[PDB]
């Protein structure tokens, strides 16, 4: 079809980069600036994958994924979290609340594309 993506980051450049890169790759992309706006969008549709920054406004990315995992329709949905941390020990919180995998910032298009590809 064209996998449906919800990307959440308060950074304008991050949203534009993700949106442009994924859309050029055949994805249907929807962006949000914070956890509140993201949750509201996720609640109203059915995204195939969610990409979310850990340092989101309104709530941490951890609380966001946790709230997302609380909705039955998103129990198995792959979630990819953006972080500046390369150290696994530093974000065990991610696996705990239900994150599927990570994407370390700063990344590039190929990193983004391959990483997404590998969690679907």
Numbering used by the authors: -1, 1 to 119
Relevant lines from the article:
Vibrio cholerae contains multiple copies of chemotaxis response regulator (VcCheY1–VcCheY4) whose functions are elusive yet. Autophosphorylated CheA then donates phosphate to the response regulator CheY. Phosphorylated CheY interacts with the flagellar motor protein FliM and influence the direction of flagellar rotation from counter clock wise (CCW) to clock wise (CW). As expected, both VcCheY3 and VcCheY4 possess (β/α)5 fold typical of the response regulators.
VcCheY4 was crystallized in two different states; one is in free state with no ligand attached (VcCheY4free) and another with a sulfate and a Ca2+ ion bound at the active site (VcCheY4sulf). In contrast to that, neither a metal ion nor a sulfate ion was observed at the active site of VcCheY4free although both of these components were added during crystallization. Absence of the divalent metal ion do not cause any change in the side chain conformation of D9 and D52 compared to VcCheY4sulf, but the carbonyl oxygen of N54 points away from the metal binding side. As a result, the β3α3 loop of VcCheY4free takes a different conformation and moves about 3 Å away from the active site. In VcCheY4free, helix α4 is shorter and β4α4 loop is unusually longer compared to those of VcCheY4sulf. The plot of B′-values indicated that the crystallographic B-factor of the β4α4 loop is much lower in VcCheY4sulf compared to that of VcCheY4free. Interestingly, when VcCheY4free is superposed on VcCheY4sulf significant differences are observed at the active site, together with helix α4, β4α4 loop and β3α3 loop. Our packing analysis suggests that, in either case, these regions are rather loosely packed and their conformations are not influenced by crystal packing. The crucial residue at β5 that acquires ‘in’ position upon activation is a Trp (W101) in case of VcCheY4 and in both the structures of VcCheY4 the side chain of W101 acquired ‘in’ position. In fact, this is the first structure of a naturally occurring CheY where Trp at this crucial position is observed to spontaneously occupy ‘in’ position, even without activation.
